[PDB]
Amino acid sequence: AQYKFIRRWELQMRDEWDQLEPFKGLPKPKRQFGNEAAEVIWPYALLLERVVKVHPFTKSIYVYYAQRQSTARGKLAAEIARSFAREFLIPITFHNSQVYTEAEMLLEYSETPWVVLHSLDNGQKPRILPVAPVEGTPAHTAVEQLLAEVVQGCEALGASVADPVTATRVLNERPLQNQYVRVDYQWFGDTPDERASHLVRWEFEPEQIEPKIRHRTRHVLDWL
Amino acid sequence: DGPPELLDRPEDGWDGSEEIALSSVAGXXXXXXXXXX
Amino acid sequence: LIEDDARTPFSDPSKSFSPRVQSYGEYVRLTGKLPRDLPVLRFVLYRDSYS
Amino acid sequence: PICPGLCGELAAVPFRVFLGTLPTLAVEERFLRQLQPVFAWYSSRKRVKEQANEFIEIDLASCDAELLLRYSHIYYVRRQLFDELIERQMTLLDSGKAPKMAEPSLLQCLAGCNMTIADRLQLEIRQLGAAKRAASVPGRRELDPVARLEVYDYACMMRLVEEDAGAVGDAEMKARAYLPREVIESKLGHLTQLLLGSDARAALDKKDVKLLNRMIPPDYTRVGCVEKLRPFDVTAYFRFYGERINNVKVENYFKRALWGHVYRRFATTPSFLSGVSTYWARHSGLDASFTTTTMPQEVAVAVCDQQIQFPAIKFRAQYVYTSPETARQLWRTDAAVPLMRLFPLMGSRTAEDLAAGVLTDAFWMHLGLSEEENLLQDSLLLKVRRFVDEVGDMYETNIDSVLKRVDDNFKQVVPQLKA
Amino acid sequence: RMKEAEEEARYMQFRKLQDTFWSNRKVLVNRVKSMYN
Amino acid sequence: YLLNKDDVLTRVLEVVKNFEKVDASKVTPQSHFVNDLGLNSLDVVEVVFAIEQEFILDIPDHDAEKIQSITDAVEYISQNPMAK
Amino acid sequence: DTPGMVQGRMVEEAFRTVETADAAIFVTAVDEDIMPEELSLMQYLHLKHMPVVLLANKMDLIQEEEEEAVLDRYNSLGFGNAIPFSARRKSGLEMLAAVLEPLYHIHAMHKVENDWDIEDLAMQGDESAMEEIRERNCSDRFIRIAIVGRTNSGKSSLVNRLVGF
Amino acid sequence: LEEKQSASAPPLQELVDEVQSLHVLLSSPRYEDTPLATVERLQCAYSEALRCVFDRVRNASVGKTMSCNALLFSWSLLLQGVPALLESLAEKRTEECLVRALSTVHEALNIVLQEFNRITHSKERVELLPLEGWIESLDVVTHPLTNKDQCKLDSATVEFVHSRAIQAAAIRMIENDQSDVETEPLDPYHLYILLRCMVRLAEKGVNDSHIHRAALLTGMVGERIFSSLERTVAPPRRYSLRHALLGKQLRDASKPHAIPLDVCAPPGGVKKPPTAADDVLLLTRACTLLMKVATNVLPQTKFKVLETVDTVLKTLSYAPNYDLSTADTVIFSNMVLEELHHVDEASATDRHLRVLLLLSRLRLSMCADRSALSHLFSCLCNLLPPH
Amino acid sequence: SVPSAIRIDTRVAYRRLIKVADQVTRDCPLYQTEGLRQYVGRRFLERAERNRQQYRHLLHQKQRVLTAQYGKFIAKELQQVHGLAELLLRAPGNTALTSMLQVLSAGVGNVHYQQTVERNYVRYCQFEEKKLDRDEVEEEATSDRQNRIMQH
Ligand SMILES: *P(=O)(O)OCC(C)(C)[C@@H](O)C(=O)NCCC(=O)NCCSC(=O)CCCCCCCCC
Ligand SMILES: Nc1nc2c(ncn2[C@@H]2O[C@H](COP(=O)(O)OP(=O)(O)OP(=O)(O)O)[C@@H](O)[C@H]2O)c(=O)[nH]1
């Protein structure tokens, strides 16, 4: 029995590594029925193709859509919200690093999906924007229209902050939110320095630049 | 097509003994302000 | 913190440093509580060649 | 689902439902596939994790037990739930040793009703037995559809037969989409003010609101979502609100039950439901292009026929609780679904509930208010007022004529099986 | 400059106490001027 | 010589309210330990023993098996002269 | 002292030493979150039916406000009431001593009871029991044999062959 | 939490509140270090507010005109501030002015006394006034101002008001009609007033039932205050398991060391106290009055009195030093020492430790009345350690 | 479900066990307020539910002769509970049993750590009982041997 139990342990660990060995240092995302875009391994090529910039004072973007729809335009709006959540939610958080993006599929017969925008100002109520695409406009255009609406709503909600200085303070003190994202850095570089090697890096701190080894001058001469 | 766990699949071959069952059992004062009315 | 050896260069990560005190601290007088009912204080004064 | 809104005050009864073993959570994946309309309740319920097993803590006194028994589709799960309910009710009865007993006169009036119920009982059971052998449909599936039909699966089989009678799929979900809770409460307060000028209270009490929250499954709690109610939940809310808001004295429980069943019928009728319903996005003010403020009449009638169906099973399940001596005999042999929310309202309360329900069903069948139009007519309101007042006064004065009325009205509401 | 204001809060406690002791004697002196005149 | 029923009720009320399984809003001066409070028999043994803690008197086995209601606990301690 | 879990798996030598032990002190650190290899070992120790006590080391890095949420997660990890510990500050040894004290007396009981069983068996005339008692009562000084040499000389394989595994 | 909160999303009363605030600022011990100019300003404001309240009351002169509860609370305030009110109303330092002010106050109190006579003649129900109302009525009917040595007095009225207050206390202690938040049965000030009335009627209130009800009331109040202080200073998570396994034990037995009485957190800051500025003082004085009342009772109720004394003593040990009033605390301590002079078992050790720690805490050189210090000297010279 | 006699017997046993646990928490200092009470209640309720499920399975003249066996089994378990209460009463004198009860009240480790302390408790009491007898018979034997040697 113990032999088969150890074999089971080995197989379980092997599959868990094959799934998460290059992503073991990252936290795990939510296991919701709309957050399938968080467990997939995102190509850095797609992440570079889709670079969305939202207002820095925004903190959360949620996209709620319904599972089943009884109306044709309701099903169309649900598909639009699903496509937007699968296309731009991960790029937004990956390129902003201060916003938390989440999508969810409510198991109900609704025909109007929506998006919720939360700002860094706790004293400011969140905003709700419905997904109401034009029947004549295609899905590829409706997704871009929803993205435009979301970006403009984020801009308005960030500009309508109560105390911009306090908002900047809480932004500077807030940690990173996209630590769960599984990015496959393909031929670009395993390290940010390897990625930006084609550029001159002027932003460095001498405390970290200074080598902290014995005979560091000898080693620097050998390296140079 | 959506979440496969939510997607329904049929059970053509199922064992009566395959069912599993287990039994487990579950294991400030304040001040009173007075206002004359 | 000030070095303990001049032979060891500052580039050595395991260089020893000991603390030397620059100021022992800051002090203020102690002023007790003065009772509302008994403000008058009686005392004895001993002066050696003081006016 | 036998008596919407019929609830009594009792403590919490915890029960741990086994969800499976990590990582092969078979019961949990079956629940994910089946409990889709009650997935909000499922996700809201707490998750307790043992060392190597998974359990969920449900409240047997709350609607959790009945919802699981109705939507389970798992024979051994619902069997364990039914057996635990029966055993805990037996233990509670043996420990209480003193339940309130009804009068022997009214119990004799209800005893003769089962003699006529047993004729349609065999017919309605065959409908439930035939539906079990039709589990090969991709809509609803079961483990052993060829096995013998048992007593605990009655709720699921009744739900399936009601779906087949309505002929509209996901009618409960389509009705929950158009039945928000706040607008339903507002329309119910309006109807209560129309029915009673000063006889109604200003609002409901906190204990009653707590009982309602325990008996109604919760919806999602997102930022933009609103509390939506199923049609059965709206019926239960109407019944509970009326029965708790009428200013009839606590000793005159019969008139309170009559008002409760009147509100239950006002909620079960399709015209009033579609008239008082509105889309959730319109109620919230989010969207103004897909207003669709009116509920689809086809879905409304198809979902009201579900609640209209199966009178005999409900009457039998309530007669089981009408007397404690007969409950010990009919809990393991006769057709009966056990609900912990029926135990605090013992013999007297449930007997008066049965009588009031029979009388209200007969009044509705006689006046034809189920389909005509516009129940808010002042003439119909005054007629209902006079009906409830006369019946309450008669029940207080002379009970023999009331029992004769109950017998005649029972023969009226549930006719004998023909051919 | 925010930490500079935090250092003044430590020493402001002892400046209020010196102003209180001087004002207490001012009140006590005026009481004596009335008891005798 | 005997404790008054008002004081002996406040004590038994405060114990069942501060109990580990009983809710404050569910208890009332006229309530049953099993039906109105929802406690099991092994929990009734605990709440009676908690009453034996504040009232230094010792209750025998037969006289403790009769205390299934809060009013029953009040009547027993009131008639018992050995209560502090 | 056993080696850590490398690549989510403990070496075979460590598994045999853990099985030989009576109890286990699962030492986890607070600077890093709970990792899958820790959960894999926790369930392995559970399936082996061995007493394990959770010890949360490196508590000196925890602030006064975050100690609540940290211990809540450690107590909901299957093992109850994780012991806060700090090896740099040497905090928690008197608290760890109170936990290993019952196991100390239980082992003392099993040892004396086993000695009585072997004594009774040897009085019956069993050679294995008399030989066991002879090795016990033989009170002589241990001979420390150190096997040293150069790297890759095969001394680790030499002791493994001498021991038998 | 963000998801959850987003899913969720000159009146007489003001005059009375101002009078109460100024009185607590002038009488609380932790404000004794206030500057003298501020003390004089607060005292002038308090005198002016009390004069305005008394003027309003004497101009109304009818309970049914304004209120009953408001009138009773206003008269309780005026009674607790009689000397300042008299010095403000007489407007001069003269015996004739004092007599005039006292006569005016007697005239104004005749209204309340006649209202009490009318109520006790009509036999009103206890639902008329709350427990606070009945206690204030008992205070204003038993206050020595009526017999200072021309008012309407009646011992039947006194006994009726006393019985009504006791019945209202019983009702309030048995109702417990709170949903989830637990409140105190009675304010510390009203509890002190009730026990003061019981001290005044000690010749008539020797009833063990009344003494037991009062002891239970003050025990509940002390339990509230102690629970507040304990929630304020509580041991942390890092020491929770250490206390569960070891329990504040020491490495070596005979170090020697100081025996800890209560387990709390290590020093972490200032931890501003939550209790009011006079809660501890009122609790201490009320417990002193309770012990003075129950000095001669049966052992069955004496046990409950001693348990309440132990609860109040624990509350005092938890209370800070600036909130501890030296005079009232030393009075309470010497009374507890007189009680400990009786040979007690299994609790004399901890009681002696509590009392001696509380005595070492405070400053005996700052005590106002020297009679308490002399009695403490006697009690400590006559005190015997446990066996 | 369970007959009234067995219910009354188990209630008396549980009350005795609670009284003994409180007396032990008083006599030997258990530094946690609830202490052994929660653990004892949990274990007792778990065993009671196990035996109730066993009786439910047994419910399915054969039932007449099996109910007597079930009653004898319950009586044996109750005698075990009473002996355990006696051993808890004798614990506060010994310091090892005090440490076992203290660690059980604190509730550290896992089910296997809390079970080896629970099972070996009564075994430790029996071992302390046998140890005195062994030491006494050995000292009497060596005294007789010394007296016999001194005679020659
Ligand atoms: P009530 O009358 O509703 O409860 C009656 C119950 C007990 C529920 C019966 O229905 C029942 O289940 N009876 C049979 C079970 C029974 O009698 N159990 C007695 C327990 S004996 C036992 O083995 C328990 C030992 C636990 C001791 C734990 C040791 C911890 C100390 C460290
Ligand atoms: N802050 C803090 N650091 C500690 C503490 N204990 C150990 N460390 C640090 O953690 C590092 C781990 O040292 P080890 O004892 O070798 O860790 P290990 O468990 O033996 O790990 P491996 O042998 O590599 O499997 C040490 O170098 C210490 O600097 C502690 O209690 N607090």
mmCIF file of all heavy atoms in Angstrom, chain H residues 14-32:
data_model
loop_
_atom_site.group_PDB
_atom_site.id
_atom_site.type_symbol
_atom_site.label_atom_id
_atom_site.label_comp_id
_atom_site.label_asym_id
_atom_site.label_seq_id
_atom_site.Cartn_x
_atom_site.Cartn_y
_atom_site.Cartn_z
ATOM 1 N N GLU H 14 -30.023 69.963 26.164
ATOM 2 C CA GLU H 14 -28.679 70.500 25.986
ATOM 3 C C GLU H 14 -28.157 71.106 27.281
ATOM 4 O O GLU H 14 -26.978 70.946 27.618
ATOM 5 C CB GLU H 14 -28.674 71.535 24.860
ATOM 6 C CG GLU H 14 -27.303 72.108 24.524
ATOM 7 C CD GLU H 14 -26.949 73.323 25.362
ATOM 8 O OE1 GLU H 14 -27.854 73.881 26.017
ATOM 9 O OE2 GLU H 14 -25.763 73.719 25.364
ATOM 10 N N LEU H 15 -29.020 71.810 28.020
ATOM 11 C CA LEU H 15 -28.599 72.372 29.301
ATOM 12 C C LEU H 15 -28.170 71.276 30.270
ATOM 13 O O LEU H 15 -27.148 71.406 30.954
ATOM 14 C CB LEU H 15 -29.724 73.211 29.904
ATOM 15 C CG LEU H 15 -30.172 74.443 29.114
ATOM 16 C CD1 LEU H 15 -31.270 75.187 29.857
ATOM 17 C CD2 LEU H 15 -28.994 75.362 28.832
ATOM 18 N N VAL H 16 -28.937 70.186 30.333
ATOM 19 C CA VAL H 16 -28.608 69.079 31.225
ATOM 20 C C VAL H 16 -27.300 68.421 30.806
ATOM 21 O O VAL H 16 -26.454 68.098 31.651
ATOM 22 C CB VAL H 16 -29.772 68.071 31.255
ATOM 23 C CG1 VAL H 16 -29.286 66.696 31.678
ATOM 24 C CG2 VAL H 16 -30.869 68.562 32.187
ATOM 25 N N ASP H 17 -27.109 68.213 29.501
ATOM 26 C CA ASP H 17 -25.866 67.612 29.027
ATOM 27 C C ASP H 17 -24.668 68.492 29.359
ATOM 28 O O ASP H 17 -23.616 67.991 29.775
ATOM 29 C CB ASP H 17 -25.946 67.356 27.522
ATOM 30 C CG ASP H 17 -26.967 66.291 27.165
ATOM 31 O OD1 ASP H 17 -27.208 65.392 27.998
ATOM 32 O OD2 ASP H 17 -27.528 66.352 26.051
ATOM 33 N N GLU H 18 -24.813 69.809 29.197
ATOM 34 C CA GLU H 18 -23.713 70.717 29.509
ATOM 35 C C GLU H 18 -23.412 70.727 31.001
ATOM 36 O O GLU H 18 -22.241 70.730 31.403
ATOM 37 C CB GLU H 18 -24.040 72.125 29.016
ATOM 38 C CG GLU H 18 -22.907 73.132 29.172
ATOM 39 C CD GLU H 18 -21.853 73.021 28.081
ATOM 40 O OE1 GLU H 18 -21.438 71.891 27.749
ATOM 41 O OE2 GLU H 18 -21.441 74.072 27.549
ATOM 42 N N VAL H 19 -24.452 70.741 31.838
ATOM 43 C CA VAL H 19 -24.248 70.683 33.282
ATOM 44 C C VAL H 19 -23.513 69.405 33.662
ATOM 45 O O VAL H 19 -22.569 69.429 34.462
ATOM 46 C CB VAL H 19 -25.595 70.803 34.019
ATOM 47 C CG1 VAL H 19 -25.431 70.446 35.486
ATOM 48 C CG2 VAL H 19 -26.153 72.207 33.877
ATOM 49 N N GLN H 20 -23.923 68.272 33.087
ATOM 50 C CA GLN H 20 -23.280 67.003 33.409
ATOM 51 C C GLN H 20 -21.823 66.992 32.966
ATOM 52 O O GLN H 20 -20.945 66.519 33.700
ATOM 53 C CB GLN H 20 -24.050 65.851 32.761
ATOM 54 C CG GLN H 20 -23.540 64.464 33.119
ATOM 55 C CD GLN H 20 -24.013 63.991 34.482
ATOM 56 O OE1 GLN H 20 -24.369 64.793 35.345
ATOM 57 N NE2 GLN H 20 -24.025 62.678 34.679
ATOM 58 N N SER H 21 -21.543 67.513 31.768
ATOM 59 C CA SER H 21 -20.169 67.537 31.278
ATOM 60 C C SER H 21 -19.286 68.422 32.150
ATOM 61 O O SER H 21 -18.164 68.040 32.502
ATOM 62 C CB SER H 21 -20.138 68.013 29.826
ATOM 63 O OG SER H 21 -20.628 69.335 29.713
ATOM 64 N N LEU H 22 -19.776 69.608 32.513
ATOM 65 C CA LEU H 22 -18.981 70.491 33.358
ATOM 66 C C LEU H 22 -18.774 69.892 34.744
ATOM 67 O O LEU H 22 -17.686 70.010 35.322
ATOM 68 C CB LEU H 22 -19.641 71.866 33.441
ATOM 69 C CG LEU H 22 -19.673 72.589 32.093
ATOM 70 C CD1 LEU H 22 -20.430 73.901 32.180
ATOM 71 C CD2 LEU H 22 -18.259 72.817 31.582
ATOM 72 N N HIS H 23 -19.792 69.216 35.284
ATOM 73 C CA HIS H 23 -19.636 68.579 36.586
ATOM 74 C C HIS H 23 -18.605 67.460 36.535
ATOM 75 O O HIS H 23 -17.789 67.323 37.453
ATOM 76 C CB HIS H 23 -20.975 68.040 37.081
ATOM 77 C CG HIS H 23 -20.860 67.176 38.297
ATOM 78 N ND1 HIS H 23 -20.203 67.582 39.438
ATOM 79 C CD2 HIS H 23 -21.308 65.924 38.547
ATOM 80 C CE1 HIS H 23 -20.255 66.619 40.340
ATOM 81 N NE2 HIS H 23 -20.921 65.601 39.825
ATOM 82 N N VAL H 24 -18.629 66.642 35.479
ATOM 83 C CA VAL H 24 -17.663 65.551 35.405
ATOM 84 C C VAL H 24 -16.258 66.098 35.178
ATOM 85 O O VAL H 24 -15.282 65.546 35.699
ATOM 86 C CB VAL H 24 -18.074 64.523 34.329
ATOM 87 C CG1 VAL H 24 -17.786 65.029 32.926
ATOM 88 C CG2 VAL H 24 -17.380 63.196 34.570
ATOM 89 N N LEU H 25 -16.130 67.210 34.446
ATOM 90 C CA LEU H 25 -14.815 67.819 34.269
ATOM 91 C C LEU H 25 -14.294 68.421 35.567
ATOM 92 O O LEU H 25 -13.081 68.417 35.805
ATOM 93 C CB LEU H 25 -14.867 68.892 33.181
ATOM 94 C CG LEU H 25 -15.014 68.413 31.737
ATOM 95 C CD1 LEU H 25 -15.035 69.598 30.786
ATOM 96 C CD2 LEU H 25 -13.896 67.455 31.376
ATOM 97 N N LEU H 26 -15.183 68.944 36.411
ATOM 98 C CA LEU H 26 -14.738 69.546 37.664
ATOM 99 C C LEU H 26 -14.485 68.512 38.754
ATOM 100 O O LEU H 26 -13.652 68.745 39.635
ATOM 101 C CB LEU H 26 -15.764 70.569 38.150
ATOM 102 C CG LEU H 26 -15.912 71.841 37.314
ATOM 103 C CD1 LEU H 26 -17.021 72.714 37.872
ATOM 104 C CD2 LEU H 26 -14.599 72.604 37.266
ATOM 105 N N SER H 27 -15.179 67.374 38.719
ATOM 106 C CA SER H 27 -15.099 66.404 39.802
ATOM 107 C C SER H 27 -14.268 65.171 39.469
ATOM 108 O O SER H 27 -13.943 64.405 40.383
ATOM 109 C CB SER H 27 -16.507 65.959 40.215
ATOM 110 O OG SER H 27 -17.169 65.306 39.147
ATOM 111 N N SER H 28 -13.917 64.955 38.206
ATOM 112 C CA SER H 28 -13.165 63.761 37.857
ATOM 113 C C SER H 28 -11.725 63.878 38.352
ATOM 114 O O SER H 28 -11.152 64.972 38.347
ATOM 115 C CB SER H 28 -13.182 63.543 36.348
ATOM 116 O OG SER H 28 -14.508 63.405 35.875
ATOM 117 N N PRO H 29 -11.115 62.772 38.785
ATOM 118 C CA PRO H 29 -9.741 62.869 39.300
ATOM 119 C C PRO H 29 -8.704 63.076 38.213
ATOM 120 O O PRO H 29 -7.732 63.810 38.427
ATOM 121 C CB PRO H 29 -9.551 61.532 40.028
ATOM 122 C CG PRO H 29 -10.467 60.597 39.324
ATOM 123 C CD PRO H 29 -11.661 61.411 38.910
ATOM 124 N N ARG H 30 -8.886 62.465 37.041
ATOM 125 C CA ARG H 30 -7.878 62.583 35.993
ATOM 126 C C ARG H 30 -7.812 63.975 35.383
ATOM 127 O O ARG H 30 -6.949 64.215 34.532
ATOM 128 C CB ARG H 30 -8.129 61.545 34.896
ATOM 129 C CG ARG H 30 -9.259 61.877 33.939
ATOM 130 C CD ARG H 30 -9.432 60.749 32.936
ATOM 131 N NE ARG H 30 -10.466 61.023 31.943
ATOM 132 C CZ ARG H 30 -10.953 60.111 31.108
ATOM 133 N NH1 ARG H 30 -10.506 58.864 31.151
ATOM 134 N NH2 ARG H 30 -11.889 60.444 30.231
ATOM 135 N N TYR H 31 -8.688 64.890 35.790
ATOM 136 C CA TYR H 31 -8.611 66.283 35.378
ATOM 137 C C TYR H 31 -8.054 67.180 36.475
ATOM 138 O O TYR H 31 -8.004 68.402 36.298
ATOM 139 C CB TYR H 31 -9.990 66.780 34.939
ATOM 140 C CG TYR H 31 -10.519 66.088 33.704
ATOM 141 C CD1 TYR H 31 -11.325 64.964 33.808
ATOM 142 C CD2 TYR H 31 -10.210 66.557 32.435
ATOM 143 C CE1 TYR H 31 -11.811 64.329 32.685
ATOM 144 C CE2 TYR H 31 -10.690 65.924 31.305
ATOM 145 C CZ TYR H 31 -11.490 64.811 31.436
ATOM 146 O OH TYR H 31 -11.973 64.177 30.315
ATOM 147 N N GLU H 32 -7.615 66.598 37.595
ATOM 148 C CA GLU H 32 -7.083 67.397 38.693
ATOM 149 C C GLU H 32 -5.848 68.189 38.292
ATOM 150 O O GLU H 32 -5.528 69.190 38.942
ATOM 151 C CB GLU H 32 -6.759 66.499 39.887
ATOM 152 C CG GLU H 32 -7.980 66.047 40.669
ATOM 153 C CD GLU H 32 -7.629 65.117 41.811
ATOM 154 O OE1 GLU H 32 -6.450 64.716 41.912
ATOM 155 O OE2 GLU H 32 -8.531 64.787 42.609
#
